Ligand binder design. Structure first.
Ligand SMILES: CCCCCCCCCCCC(=O)SCCNC(=O)CCNC(=O)[C@H](O)C(C)(C)COP(=O)(O)O
Ligand code: SF4
Ligand code: SF4
Lengths: 88, 386, 112, 115, 176, 208
């Protein structure tokens, strides 16, 4: 059979694993609702690298638009849920 | 995926420092990308830091097979900007040595094309003739190739006292050497197989892409700058212009051979019609005086000093001067700001446009056909890169 | 009748008179949509009318070629198609309007 | 006013979007460059160098200048991908044979006359 | 005024067809080419026995540079610097001062032979025939530094080659 | 005035003047100036926006037919606000004539690519971009053509130094060719040749 029925909890776990895998972010400091620019003092270029890491993690192309707004982990989870049609 | 291959610069078929990046399916050429600039020396900026006489030896080294033809084009541009006129004997000398130079260039082109194709023998037969013409160059100027003989006022020195006789002796034997070359190549079925219907270009395409010279005449376009826009004494000589029918490599080869014959005709005429007189313009504010005058007369010494330190000033203005060089239309866009140094010198070389069209001419051909096309375009990268 | 136009990629034209008449009529039709006071329209109309009259008055192809001074009537046909394409482009461009912008005072001053 | 004609972008937002796109392309290219050219640097070093080159021009406020900078960066990326460049060209970014030139007053005073 | 190079039609009579068939099947033009090469085999080669035999040259030949003297042994060069001004390659470097006897002479006269283009403009520009391009061309060195000529080297060249240089000038100065 | 002075041709001068007037009347939207040089060389100054129309008209018009582009280059004049002067040279085989079209631009303003009008321009526009830094809009494949890979700056610009900023040498420690700041064993010697006395009265400028 094909891939399992991915859920929101899996998306959040993978996204937070990716963020804690980033060197410029101290792991235990980041939260699900922490704004990338304000909370972690990340620049615009840093956000681009994180979005590309998401594209590698979940295997789908996130355009330049719709990536300019994913500014905290929760928005990333919502975007992936919308793109993959996951509700529960 | 197409195979991607580097053709040159260190390749025998490259004809210089060319990096031809080629996309191939099997041996079929899917794409040609000529990468040039491996012989870009920044000649035009350097010419900007020189005086008009100091910039002349650069035109020797632009196209190193047609030195005096390059010198003549530059001299015509500067003379047009100076509003002066070379004397008649100088103009006859210029046309004679331009035709000798055309012989040199056509020998080099045809034999290197044959050598790429695989016919190595005619090169050795024709390079002895090239050697004798190099001797003619040397007797007149002291240099085998970069003579710097043609100057914006005429020529540097008068012919030595027995040069015309030797030029006649050489010219009365050359036709048999052309005949031996044609026996080797013209009717060979292998040569025709390697040349007929290879690199066919239409008249419309040749005109739009900027082609000139043989690349036009092989496609039936009737255009020769010596006939349509004559310079020096080209209006006083008689010759035919070879014209092709099919626009392929074979037709371009026949055109060059016949061009060689017509150059012999023009040389014969120039030998029988050389007039007497002085060799540079009798105007010591442009052309240097003789050394005896320079050592006897105050004005002559002052003008020698000033012409060799500062140089003559050229009135402000811009010209585009073109000649029928052996490789096509060779041009200079020369901009003078009023001083003794050129403000701008743009050099137009036919090989630039021919190489820019190489990719078009190689559609649907193999590797060996691309080698033949590079040979038939008559490319020297000194003029392409500058 | 004639073989070998002599220029590579230029086919010999059978029935060149009809082609020339059609092309010149199309050219005049396109020029009819340009303002009458535009110089392009009047110049092109004048030359096209002369060429059309020459084509109508001379049934012989070689004599017509010598009258037209256009070099081998197939080339005359090609030039007519070029002029038609240019006429459509000029209709779109409208180059008869007043100069778009005036250059800086010392822009074309030479020397320096 | 100031009556200028754009190249690609009408304001700094579109120019920033193009900058981000070019940065994404360079970021993706770096590992392939390290593999193909057989470079002795890490992928981390290459991406750090890409970021440093991008940040060299962070002070630009003209959308036309930014458009030209993106055009030049795209030219360099196309050049790198097609292997027109050699290992020497890629390594020219790191200045490995250049001795560090000091910036403080005293060392400059010691070495010579240039400021 | 023009001619055609490839606008000839072949005859279609039976004799011409049979001749062309013989050319195709028995390879006549290939034997023609073989005959041409065989003919060249029996000619005398145009090769010369170098270094024993030399290529012909001219009195105007441009070669290695030399600084000349007057018959008294006094140097001809007066440090006018016209050669340095005219040199398109900037290959000449000159420094001058009054000599101990007040003469206008050089203290430095260098020619960078790896900058020089061997154009001969300097010997044209020289007003006293001090700098010349002598006839020598066999002066290849094993190091780059040996091709950076100072005044001593050029004066030595003049002393070594004066006999031939004067004879070359005598044969060409009436064309100058 | 006879032997050493270049002769004049007034017939060609008149023909070129009339044709310049013709071109100016047909395209008033773009033509700013028309000149005929003393040695019979027609020049037409235009507005940049008219690069594509003018050339198209010049190559297509029945009375023009300039189907061949000799060459295309640029001139740098730093004193002008629009630094760069774009020069097109065209040849007409039907009428055996030549024409020069000139326009202007600066560092940040693109010029329309004329590859569509003339196929020959491709490499000419690439060369202008490489040597001068003039961008051409809608160009098929615009990239450096003459300079080295990764070379910074444009050499033909007046401000650029003659010997540039970097040189190359082989370095054995890194086992490759490296680029370093230029050092010269002998500096190029700048000559001041301009004479303090005026040469050509006909070109004297007003004393401002
Ligand atoms: C293998 C290694 C070789 C290296 C390859 C060479 C790469 C060369 C590429 C050069 C191209 C450029 O410079 S492209 C020009 C870049 N400059 C600008 O865009 C000016 C405005 N500055 C900003 O927008 C911000 O400072 C910014 C930091 C950009 C982030 O922006 P955010 O506020 O949105 O995070
Ligand atoms: S021959 Fe020419 S390049 Fe050599 S030193 Fe004399 S002037 Fe200079
Ligand atoms: S060699 Fe001749 S030109 Fe040169 S400085 Fe001496 S005298 Fe003057």
């Amino acid at each position: 059979s094909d891939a399992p029925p991915l859920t929101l909890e899996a998306i959040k776990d993978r996204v937070l694993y990716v963020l804690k895998l980033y060197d410029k972010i101290d792991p235990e400091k980041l939260s699900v609702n922490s704004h990338f620019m304000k909370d972690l003092g990340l620049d615009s270029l840093d956000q681009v690298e994180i979005i590309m890491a998401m594209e590698d993690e979940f295997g789908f192309e996130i355009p330049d638009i719709d990536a300019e707004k994913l500014m905290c982990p929760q928005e990333i989870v919502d975007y992936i849920a919308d793109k993959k049609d996951v509700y529960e | 995926s197409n195979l991607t291959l580097n053709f040159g610069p260190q390749h025998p078929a490259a004809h210089g420092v060319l990096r031809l990046v080629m996309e191939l399916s099997g041996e079929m050429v899917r794409k040609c990308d000529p990468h040039i600039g491996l012989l870009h020396r920044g000649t035009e900026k350097l010419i900007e830091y020189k005086t008009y006489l100091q910039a002349l030896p650069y035109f020797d080294r632009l196209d190193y097979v047609s030195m005096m033809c390059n010198e003549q084009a530059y001299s015509l541009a500067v003379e047009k900007l100076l509003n002066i006129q070379p004397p008649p004997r100088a103009q006859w000398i210029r046309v004679l040595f331009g035709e000798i130079t055309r012989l040199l260039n056509h020998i080099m082109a045809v034999t290197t094309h044959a050598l790429d194709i695989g016919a190595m023998t005619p090169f050795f037969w024709m390079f002895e003739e090239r050697e004798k013409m190099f001797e003619f160059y040397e007797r007149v100027s002291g240099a085998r190739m970069h003579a710097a003989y043609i100057r914006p006022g005429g020529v540097h020195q008068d012919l030595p006292l027995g040069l015309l006789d030797d030029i006649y002796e050489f010219s009365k034997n050359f036709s048999f050497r052309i005949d031996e070359l044609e026996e080797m190549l013209t009717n060979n079925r292998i040569w025709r197989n390697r040349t007929v219907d290879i690199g066919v270009v239409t008249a419309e395409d040749a005109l739009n892409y900027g082609f000139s010279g043989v690349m036009l005449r092989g496609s039936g376009i009737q255009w020769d700058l010596r006939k349509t826009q004559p310079y020096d004494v080209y209006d006083q000589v008689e010759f035919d212009v070879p014209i092709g029918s099919r626009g392929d490599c074979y037709d371009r080869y026949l055109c060059r051979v016949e061009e060689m014959r017509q150059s012999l005709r023009i040389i014969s005429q120039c030998l029988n019609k050389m007039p007497p007189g002085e060799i540079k313009v009798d105007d010591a504010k442009v052309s240097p005086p003789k050394r005896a005058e320079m050592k006897t007369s105050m004005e002559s010494l002052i003008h020698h000093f000033k012409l060799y330190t500062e140089g003559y000033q050229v009135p402000p203005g811009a010209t585009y001067t073109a000649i029928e060089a052996p490789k096509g239309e060779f041009g200079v866009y020369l901009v003078s700001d009023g001083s003794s140094r050129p403000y701008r010198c743009k050099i137009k070389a036919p090989g630039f446009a021919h190489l820019a069209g190489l990719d078009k001419m190689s559609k649907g051909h193999m590797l060996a056909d691309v080698v033949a096309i590079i040979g038939t375009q008559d490319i020297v990268f000194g003029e392409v890169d500058r | 009748l004639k073989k070998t136009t002599g220029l590579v990629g230029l086919a010999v034209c059978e029935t060149p008179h009809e082609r020339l008449k059609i092309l010149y009529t199309k050219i005049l039709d396109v020029l009819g949509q340009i303002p009458k006071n535009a110089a392009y329209r009047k110049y092109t109309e004048q030359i096209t009318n002369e060429k059309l009259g020459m084509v109508k008055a001379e049934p012989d192809v070689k004599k017509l070629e010598e009258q037209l001074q256009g070099g081998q009537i197939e080339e005359v046909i090609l030039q007519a198609e070029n002029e038609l394409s240019l006429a459509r482009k000029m209709l779109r461009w409208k180059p008869w309007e007043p100069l778009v912008e005036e250059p800086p005072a010392n822009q074309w001053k030479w020397p320096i | 006013g100031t009556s200028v004609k754009p190249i690609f972008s009408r304001d700094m937002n579109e120019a920033k979007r193009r900058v981000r796109e070019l940065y994404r392309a360079w970021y993706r290219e770096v590992p392939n460059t390290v593999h193909l050219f057989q470079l002795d640097i890490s992928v981390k070093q290459g991406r750090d160098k890409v970021r440093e080159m991008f940040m060299k021009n962070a002070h630009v406020t003209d959308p036309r200048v930014v458009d030209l900078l993106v055009i030049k960066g795209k030219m360099e990326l196309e050049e790198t991908i097609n292997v027109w460049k050699q290992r020497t060209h890629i390594m020219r970014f790191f200045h490995e044979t250049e001795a560090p030139r000091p910036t403080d007053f005293l060392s400059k005073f010691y070495v010579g006359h240039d400021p | 005024t023009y001619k055609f190079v490839n606008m000839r039609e072949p005859s279609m009579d039976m004799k011409s067809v049979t001749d062309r068939a013989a050319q195709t099947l028995l390879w006549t033009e290939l034997v023609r080419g073989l005959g041409m090469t065989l003919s060249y085999l029996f000619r005398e080669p145009a090769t010369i026995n170098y270094p024993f035999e030399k290529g012909p040259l001219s009195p105007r030949f441009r070669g290695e540079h030399a600084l000349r003297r007057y018959p008294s042994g006094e140097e001809r060069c007066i440090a006018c610097k016209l050669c340095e001004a005219v040199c398109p390659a900037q290959a000449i470097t000159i420094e001058a001062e009054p000599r101990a006897d007040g003469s206008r002479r050089t203290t430095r006269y260098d020619i960078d032979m790896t900058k020089c283009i061997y154009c001969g403009f300097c010997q044209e520009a020289c007003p006293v025939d001090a700098i010349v391009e002598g006839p020598n061309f066999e002066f290849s060195t094993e190091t780059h530094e040996e091709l950076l000529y100072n005044k001593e080297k050029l004066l030595n060249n003049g002393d070594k080659w004066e006999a031939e240089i004067a004879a070359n000038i005598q044969a060409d100065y009436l064309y100058r | 005035t006879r032997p050493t002075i270049r002769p004049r041709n007034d017939v060609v001068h008149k023909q070129l003047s009339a044709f310049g007037q013709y071109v100016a009347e047909i395209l008033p939207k773009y033509v700013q100036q028309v000149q005929v040089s003393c040695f019979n060389e027609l020049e037409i100054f235009i507005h940049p926006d008219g690069v594509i129309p003018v050339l198209t008209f010049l190559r297509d018009h029945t009375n023009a037919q300039f189907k061949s582009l000799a060459d295309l280059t640029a001139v740098d004049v730093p004193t002008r606000q629009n630094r760069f002067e774009i020069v097109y040279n065209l040849l007409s085989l039907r009428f055996n004539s030549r024409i020069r079209v000139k326009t202007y631009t600066d560092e940040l303003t693109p010029i329309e690519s004329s590859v569509t009008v003339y196929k020959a321009a491709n490499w000419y526009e690439r060369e202008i971009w490489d040597m001068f830094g003039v961008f051409f809009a809608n160009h098929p494949d615009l990239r450096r053509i003459l300079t080295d890979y990764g070379f910074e700056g444009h050499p033909f610009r007046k401000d650029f130094p003659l010997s540039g900023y970097v040189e190359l040498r082989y370095d054995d420690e890194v086992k490759r060719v490296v680029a370093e700041p230029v050092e010269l064993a002998q500096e190029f010697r700048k000559f001041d040749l301009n004479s303090p006395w005026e040469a050509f009265p006909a070109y004297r400028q007003p004393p401002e």
